[PDB]
Every structure is written in structure tokens, then in C-alpha cells.
Amino acid sequence: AVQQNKPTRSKRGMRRSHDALTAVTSLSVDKTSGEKHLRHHITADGYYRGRKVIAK
Amino acid sequence: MIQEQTMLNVADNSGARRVMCIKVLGGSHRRYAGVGDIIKITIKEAIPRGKVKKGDVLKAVVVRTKKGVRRPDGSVIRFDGNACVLLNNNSEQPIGTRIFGPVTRELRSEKFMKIISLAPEVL
Amino acid sequence: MIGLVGKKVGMTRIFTEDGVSIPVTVIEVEANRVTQVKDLANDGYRAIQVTTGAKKANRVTKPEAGHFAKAGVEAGRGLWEFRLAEGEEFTVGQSISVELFADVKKVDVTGTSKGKGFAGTVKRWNFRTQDATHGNSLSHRVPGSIGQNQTPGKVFKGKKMAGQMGNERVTVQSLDVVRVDAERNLLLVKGAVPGATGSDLIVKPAVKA
Amino acid sequence: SNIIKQLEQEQMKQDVPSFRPGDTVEVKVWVVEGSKKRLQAFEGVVIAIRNRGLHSAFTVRKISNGEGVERVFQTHSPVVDSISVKRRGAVRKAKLYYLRERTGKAARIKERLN
Amino acid sequence: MRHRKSGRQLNRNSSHRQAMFRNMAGSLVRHEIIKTTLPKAKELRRVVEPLITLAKTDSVANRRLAFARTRDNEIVAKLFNELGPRFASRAGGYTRILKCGFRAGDNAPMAYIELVDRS
RNA sequence: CGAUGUCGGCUCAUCACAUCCUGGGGCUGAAGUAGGUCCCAAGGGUAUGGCUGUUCGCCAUUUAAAGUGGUACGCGAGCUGGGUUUAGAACGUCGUGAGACAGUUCGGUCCCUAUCUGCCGUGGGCGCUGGAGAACUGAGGGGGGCUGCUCCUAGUACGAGAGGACCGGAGUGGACGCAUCACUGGUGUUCGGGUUGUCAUGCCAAUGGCACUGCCCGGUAGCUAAAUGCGGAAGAGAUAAGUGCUGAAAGCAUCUAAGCACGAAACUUGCCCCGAGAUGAGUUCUCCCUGACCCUUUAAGGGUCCUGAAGGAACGUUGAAGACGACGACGUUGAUAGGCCGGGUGUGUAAGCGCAGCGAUGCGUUGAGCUAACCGGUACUAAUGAACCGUGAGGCUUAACCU
RNA sequence: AAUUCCUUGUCGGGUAAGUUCCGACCUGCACGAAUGGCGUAAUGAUGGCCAGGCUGUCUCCACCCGAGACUCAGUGAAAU
RNA sequence: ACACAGGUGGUCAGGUAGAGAAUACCAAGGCGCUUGAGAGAACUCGGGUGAAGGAACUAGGCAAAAUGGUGCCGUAACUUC
RNA sequence: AGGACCGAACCGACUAAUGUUGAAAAAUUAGCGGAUGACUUGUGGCUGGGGGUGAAAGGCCAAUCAAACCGGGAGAUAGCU
């Protein structure tokens, strides 16, 4: 239930070695407005795949 | 599907009215008993002047179970109650001279020819 | 003797005129086209490698496309291998159909079993549950003890514990072949074979006779 | 699938009479004792039907020799030679399981007129 | 295991799910575009598209059925007078999901769901 | 003694052979069936109940058998708390008494979110010497190995009879293990209906909310056992106890000293599964890359421009795959999921209208209406043109060919 | 026997089988008459045994509904 | 010790069903309990259902399951009536 | 009429489960006992430590009871660690 010897900072780093986040590989460029956005998601202006899907 | 502590009705006129299964014979660690397999029973209720008294220990063959039996075509025959026919402890032949209620085709063998001969209907 | 690769269509029953209902599994065994023949001279053992079915032409990658192209055969949905018996020859472009099993009586069907996910000890190894009452505390389906007190101060290798059940290769041995329908590439085997509907199956002649 | 449908419909029997729960049917089954085959009649009330194409079944319940007996027949089985509706009953359910706790006057089923 | 099953539980009991989907379907057909989480949006289709399909043929029985599944007479009236003739030729698929990022409060993947011919 | 929790039970075991059964054999005061004793053999199997807290024991009934032991008389950071073993109380006894009893009887808090080793699963990184996609070989490892009864041989051999075989063959079971939902069923709060109380939609009618899914009656797919298929083997090699052939030492005898043969569920294979991280990193098939230059510490060196392939990853729709990763299908040249159309299944004759009845209600339209996960189709919706990683012919020394 | 160590004393009932229970017997280790003896209707969240109904308590577990466990985002302990 | 599933005396007492201030659903009135979103593994908690058997479980029917209202018929030993 | 019966508020805590670094230094859920009485409760007062009080458990006397708590003798003593 509890430890008998204090784990090292080395062991702590070894355990945390897989806890790293993964950056997005590449963003997509909208074909009309030219801005970047996450793949399969609408752009920050409200466009998606050229057409303006949501007003503002 | 008969196991220990199961009460059964009696299908013959041997004098017993309500028996209780206390062992399933024919094999180590055996769980259930279908039709046509011997079980060791105790008599828990009998008629006043019959061939057997209350509390005797003897064998019996199961002729009707509520779970029923299955035939090679996939059919199943289910009965409304579990019934047995009392047998002699050594010869394993029926004590009574008449059978009550129907029985199934699973019994037709040289061992129980008497029972299927005396049965009023063999399903 | 070699076997064939089929697909589980499902289960049904066959009625015989004697009044017996045989439960059968319908295996659609399409033609197995040989794609490479291995020999002692080059590979150190004798075997054939067959394929079956079709695959999307934009889904087949270039290495296996070239491999199929060398044999001059259209791409299938996989590649399986059968060890050759003594005195059994096959050519490269040859197609083998379900009529190979025309007079065999029993087969061995091997497939990847259904996946039960992370299964407990009770389901996986038929362990007994503990009491549901009589004062029991949070231990109704746990595996109980797994060792002894301090002399063998470890758990023994090969212990039965909870884990991934299924989704592994399983062979069911000595099934009776009920019918070989060569006209529509069907094989009906008696019994239940491993695997869900639509999975691949490897049917080989019974080793145990 | 088409393969299973073809396999079942090439084995189905094309002379199955139409019946509903509550009907009183009489099914003739093949009995093979020794080397000879005969026809045993089983007559009762249909308490449940299970429509599954070739895997169709139906449960008939009768009171034979004072003991309630029910048998589930496979509709397309070759052991069943013929089925005959002796009398049609009027019920408002698909499964008449409630009949098992009733005897005599309390288990009568009104005839299905028209 | 949940082999060949369908329907997201969404960490709610069945009555809550039924009521929530009823409300969400009403809101969607009222406003013509709504924003909700991606699994809820994907599950909302299976409730709002059969209602429109039912609404395609105007009949007293169909209206009572739509009323039983929505409990809002204005919603039923709109469905049968507008959404039915508008989608009278479509073979299903009267909605469109557009993934719109992640919610600030709980990082839930959000989406907009709108009728195909909104404009 | 700055705490090593203890009797019995439940769950889960693992080892030894001084073997309980099955297997092989010698002697028998072994006619046969059935036994006694000893030797070899641990591969598998080795009860359910009545009584007591019981281990032990007696008893009832099975079984081929109900083994003896080790593992802190295994196992409470897995469970129990009946006995024992705190505080309360009483009986018998001892003591004047407080109290005490291997004397009994009633009641009496069992904590811990796992850091490390271990074990069951499942990934990430790198290696395997250019990179990649597949399919394998098998060094090694695991699983599995139990047995009854009936029939034929044959009422034969044996025996005065009663009784009753060895060896060999066939069928059908008990327990265990693997797989599956085609059959029989369970679940199926995502499907349909009956019905009680109340509230809401203006009201009737019809519905919806709540009352454990309000209470029930059924039940699709999926998952399941009680349901139904399969398995333990046959065969080979070398053996244990044992049985031998020929044969001296030792004119005889002798299974052994030389030489040769047989012999068991034990060993190695044969059956199933994992398996080249087998760093000893293996084998086979296929695909991709055939540009120009600078620098100094001149070497498996570093840098710039052009170039980005085969393939992989990421994202999306997802799965009878799944805790999360992983694995599998599909991404417009598309049936991957949702919807839609048709069918199947389940429920059981919907609503509206008309007729009969004062009315409850019945009949017709009507086997109607509704129908999830199923089946066969259908691009209507969502699966984007891209972009990212991975490179640009792959070190040295010998040997055999090639020119 | 709330009391008997030997003791599961012996017999009878109940059970196929009853170290507990009930009814007797008396060889009362070591009951006994207001530190009360023996009964006793009614009463008890009192101790023991048996029977009917009822059941996942069990043979033997299976499925389903939610709340955690698992993943993501935010805050963020403890014994040792 | 906390924006703590605990403790705190008196007053008011609506509708329907109900004997009722029990219980269910509502009015007047007030809240959804200060982390959410997914997924639908083992295992834990609180529940629902179950084939055939019905205490074989266990120290013990512990716990679950079952009975449950009103009117009427009828009701034993024993007893201090 | 009743230390009568069934059963809410109210008082209590018999059995099981959960929780045992808890929501809680003893509670929650499902059952349970009393419920016109030797009942229960609010406000104020009285009984003080070898003392009180006790339908009696050495129980309770401010989460502390085979002699409370606070200050003092006091750095008690300790052949012990």
C-alpha cells in the first residue's frame, strides 16, 4: 500500500517519459479564405471547405 | 434435470406419493439427472397401506422432468412436473403394476421394457 | 495435405430425411490462387502460398502489388500458407477450388476467436465466485489468493489471472464435412467454428484422422 | 445474407397451414420404433409461435393423462408430416404462457369466429 | 462487451436521455442550427431524421405520433407545414454535422448541426 | 516483544512419492471373478450431505478413486469472525472477599487509493547496418494427457457347481477444457401492448411526465448455459521395474562381463497456441530512391541549394477489435458509419370514421399500426485539394566468380 | 441442565444420515428451596431445533440499468 | 476546524386518491445539490430479471425473496378467562 | 379505562451492506422497537473530583473518566530505553 524506499528523480523522469504531448502534424488551409484550421473542423471565421457554413 | 433435495411426484402405484432425490447415481461429481437414469431417493410421503413405507431408501428412474429432453430434430417435450417410477434396490425393476401419465421415447430399452409396456401413452 | 481459406457466412441447420437436424456452419470458400511456391532448394522446406477474394486497387500497396504481379494474379484480401505433403506438386498460376475436399470426411477449422475484451478470472478460467452475502466485503468476484506466505516469496509464472480473452488463433478439430457444394463455392461443416461472421477461416484436413 | 436465405428457402416446406396463437391444432409426427415407422397424433392448443424462416417453431400444450404436457415442434422438420387446425381460438396475445397456471373452466379459450 | 449494439449512454439514465433528445430535437427544428457536443450531435440525428421522415406525409395519425415524440404542438406544426415539403424529395440525411473545435469550460469536442438547405 | 495476526471455513493453488485409482511387472496359502504383498511410475484425476466453530471422527449414499504430506500444520495489505482471545452478564466450583477456571453458556468495530520485486494482459522508444509492405522457418515456452458402463469375442478359457475372464474390437455417458447462438432457453430500463393513482397538452378522444423500467406480459440483435459441436488418442524413438536369446569368467549354471530383442498414462516427439529482442536479432517474395556543391581537425566528418519516392503517421466515418494505446475496414475512382427504401422479426387488430348498445364496451376498415442493435440495396449526410515524417543507391577486410 | 469432566453417557422422536433440539433414565466430577426450588397464560429487535410458502443463499452463475473504476481538459492531497 | 449527506424548539397546513400530518403526483412558492465531456473492460457500490432445482449455502434462512388493505365465513392446544 | 394493539411526527439504535486518509473523530440506505406514558422536548436553575450523579455499565461529569480539566510543588522519581 505504501513505499519502503524513496523513488528517485531518475525513476520519476523514466515514468514521465511517455507523458509528453504530441503537437499537431500539419494544419489545413481553407481553399477560399486561406486561413489555417484543424483538419475536418471549420475555420475560426466560420468557413469549411470553401463555403461559409456559419454566420457571425 | 433432477439434483439433490428435489421433490418428485410418483408415476406408479407403488404406494409412494412424494419422494426426494438424495444422490444422482452414475458417475463422480455428477450434477443433474435427465430421464432414464437412476437416482437414489428417500420417501417423504406415502399412502396408508402401500408396498412401501415412509422413510425407505431405494432407487428410482426418472420418467418426466420440467426441463425436458431434446430429440435429434431439435424439438423439446416439457412436462408440468418432475415424476419418477420406484425401482427395486437390487434388480432395478418397477415395484408397482401400473404407470400413470405419459413417458417419452428415451426409455425404450431392454432395462425398462416393463415400464414402457405398462405406460398409458409413450410420447 | 493442403487446405483452403474461406469466410464464415453464418450458422444454419440441415435436415436429413431420417429426421435428424445437423447444425452446420456455412463457409464460403472461393478459389485460392497460388502466388508463390516454396521449395527445399530456395526456402529449405516445401509449401505453397495462396490468396483469395479481392481487394481495392487503390488500397493495395506497391510491394504486395508487385508480388501479385510477378505471379500474374489479381490481388486478394490476404496471404496464407500451407505446408506441402510428400509427392504433392503445384504450379504458380494454379487456382484451387472447393472440390479438393470432395471425399474427405473430417476437417480441422482454425480461425481467430471472438474477442471478449478484458475478461475477469471467473469468465476466463471458470473460477468460482465467492459468497454474495454472509458478511462478504468487496470480494464477490476477485480471484482470491495467488501465492503462499514468504517461503515462495513471488507469484508463480503461468498463474491464471484476468486479462485479454479471445481474439487469438483457435483450432477446432475433427469436424464432419456435411456437404461440398462446388457449384456455388460453399462448404458446410458440422458444428461451430471459431470467429464472428465475415472473418477468415483456414480449413485443413483432419490431422487426427 | 443471400447465401443463408437461399440455403434455408431451398429446404422450407411449402404446405405449412396458417395458424395463430390460441388455435387448437393436431400435428402428426413420425415415430420410428424398431424398424417400422408410424404416425402418432398430438393434439392441443398453440400457446406460442416463433417465426424464424426455416428455424420456425411452435409450442403446443395438451393435458394428457391428468398431467400438463407441452411440446415445441420445429415447423419445417421432416418428422412433422401434417398439421391440421381443428378449432381456431380468439386471444389477444402472442404467447399464451398464462395457461400453465390454469386448469378446467379457467383455461377455456373463446372460438375465433369470422 | 457491446458487440453489434448501438446507442451512446452519455453518462445519464434512459429517461434523462429520452427527455434531453426530445428537447434537443425541438431546439434544432426551432432554430435550424444548434451547437452541442459531437457524440450527442451524432446521436441526435437518429431521433430528428425519423421525425422529419414521418412529417413528410401529413396525416392526423402521423401528427399524433410526432406529438408523442416531441410534446410541442408548435414544433409538430412547423415540422409538417415546412420541413416535410422542403425535404419531400430527400432520401434521408436531412442534417449536417460540422465539428467546431473544443469547449472552453470542459474541453468537450463541440459541433454545429444544421438542416442541409438552411440558406 | 519501537507488533512476524492466530483455529476452522470460502476462493485460488503449487511441489514431493513413503501411489488412493488408471498403466507395467515378480511371488502368492494366485483355478476363474475378486483379492494380499512388494518393485517401477506424479501424466491426469482424487465426492456430496447429517452433527459440532471444528481440524479429527462417526454415519447415509455414490465413485475407478474419495491418498499421505510440504508450502508461516500455504493463503485475513483476498473474504469470514462461529470457537478462541479484551471490556457486559450468568451457572457449577474455589476463596471471608476482590476475583479466578485446558469448565460451560448469551452478546461482542477484521483498516490500507500498490512505490519496488512477482504474476496476467496491452502499448511507446530503439536495435536487427539503406528504407518499406507482407508471408514464414523454429531455437525456445505454455496448454492438453482422467475414466465408467453396455454389447461382440463368449456364457468361450477356468471350474464339480455357484460364478466367470486375459488379449482385441464397437457404441453411449460423468467431470474438465476450447469454440459457438443454428436449435431449447435467460437477459434484452434503446421495441410493442395491458393496467392503477396523479399532473400537463384549453376540453372529449389520443398521448406524454412521475410513482423501483410505476406494476406486469412478451420479446429483435448482441452476450450467455442449462443449449450442441469438438478434444484427451492412435503411431514412432529411447527407457524404469520386469521378461528374455546366445555366452564365458566359474567344463555346469547364468538377462551381461562382449553382442542382440521386448517392455508403462513417466521422458522426447506426435495434437493446439505464443514465438527471430533466438542481440545467435534468421529465411523468402516484392516495391522505392541513380542531383549539384562548399568548409577544416581528411573522416562511418560537418554545412547549403534542389529534391520528399515506396511506405508510415496524423485527421475523419467506424468495427461481432477495444480500459487508453493497439489491431481490422473505409476516405468520393466510396457502402465505413448515420439516415432513407424494401424485406424479415417482435408486439398484437393503432389513431380517425361508421355501425350495435342508455352506457361500459364490441364489430368493420384491420393481422392493422408502431418496430432498436438484423438482412438486401441506395451517396441523401459526414468521411478534402492538401500538408507532415521517412530520402536521394547504402562502411571496412577477405574469399569464389564475372571483364 | 445457562450447571455432567469422563461424554457425542443410554434409550425413544424427528432426518437417508442429528457432538445441537425435544422426552425420559440417575452413575448429581461439582442442582436445590427468598445470593430462592419447580411450573407458568400473555409478553421479547432474547438463545437452540423442526415444518409450509418463498426465493441467485447455493448447484452455477448469466444478462441488463445507473454511480465510480478507464481516457481527455482544470484544480490538486496523504500515510511512508 | 470546511460553502460538512450529521444536530436544532415554536407557528401556517391547499388539490386528487387515501382512515390519515403515511404514500404518489401537483398548486402557491423554491430548487437541479460549484468540476464537466467521452467510453461502456476487469473489479467495487445501489438495483432489475432468470431456465431446471428450492436452504443442497452458511456458525445461523445472515442477506435477499415472500406475506401485506377493507368487509364477511371460520379459528386449536394452553390460560391468571 | 389501559406503563393496551397497528402505525407517522418525536425519542431510540436490533440486523446487514457501504463507508474505516469517510459527506461524518460513530454517520447514510433498506428493514426495526416505543409511539397517553416509568414518554419526549424548549428555557432557566441546583448537585464539583476521592466529590457529584447513576432503572447499576465503574456508565456519564464539554470528542478526555477504576478518580475530569487548568495552574503550581516540577527540570517529581526512573537500578529503564
UniProtKB/Swiss-Prot annotation, chain C:
<dbReference type="GO" id="GO:0000027">
    <property type="term" value="P:ribosomal large subunit assembly"/>
</dbReference>
<dbReference type="InterPro" id="IPR019926">
    <property type="entry name" value="Ribosomal_uL3_CS"/>
</dbReference>
<dbReference type="Pfam" id="PF00297">
    <property type="entry name" value="Ribosomal_L3"/>
</dbReference>
<keyword id="KW-0687">Ribonucleoprotein</keyword>
<keyword id="KW-0488">Methylation</keyword>
<dbReference type="InterPro" id="IPR009000">
    <property type="entry name" value="Transl_B-barrel_sf"/>
</dbReference>
<dbReference type="GO" id="GO:0022625">
    <property type="term" value="C:cytosolic large ribosomal subunit"/>
</dbReference>
<dbReference type="GO" id="GO:0002181">
    <property type="term" value="P:cytoplasmic translation"/>
</dbReference>
<dbReference type="GO" id="GO:0003735">
    <property type="term" value="F:structural constituent of ribosome"/>
</dbReference>
<dbReference type="GO" id="GO:0005737">
    <property type="term" value="C:cytoplasm"/>
</dbReference>
<keyword id="KW-0699">rRNA-binding</keyword>
<comment type="subunit">
    <text>Part of the 50S ribosomal subunit. Forms a cluster with proteins L14 and L19. In pull-down experiments interacts with CedA.</text>
</comment>
<dbReference type="GO" id="GO:0005829">
    <property type="term" value="C:cytosol"/>
</dbReference>
<feature type="modified residue" description="N5-methylglutamine">
    <location>
        <position position="150"/>
    </location>
</feature>
<keyword id="KW-0694">RNA-binding</keyword>
<dbReference type="InterPro" id="IPR019927">
    <property type="entry name" value="Ribosomal_uL3_bac/org-type"/>
</dbReference>
<comment type="function">
    <text>One of two assembly initiator proteins, it binds directly near the 3'-end of the 23S rRNA, where it nucleates assembly of the 50S subunit.</text>
</comment>
<feature type="modified residue" description="N6-succinyllysine">
    <location>
        <position position="38"/>
    </location>
</feature>
<dbReference type="InterPro" id="IPR000597">
    <property type="entry name" value="Ribosomal_uL3"/>
</dbReference>
<dbReference type="GO" id="GO:0019843">
    <property type="term" value="F:rRNA binding"/>
</dbReference>
<protein>
    <recommendedName>
        <fullName>Large ribosomal subunit protein uL3</fullName>
    </recommendedName>
</protein>
<keyword id="KW-0689">Ribosomal protein</keyword>
<comment type="similarity">
    <text>Belongs to the universal ribosomal protein uL3 family.</text>
</comment>
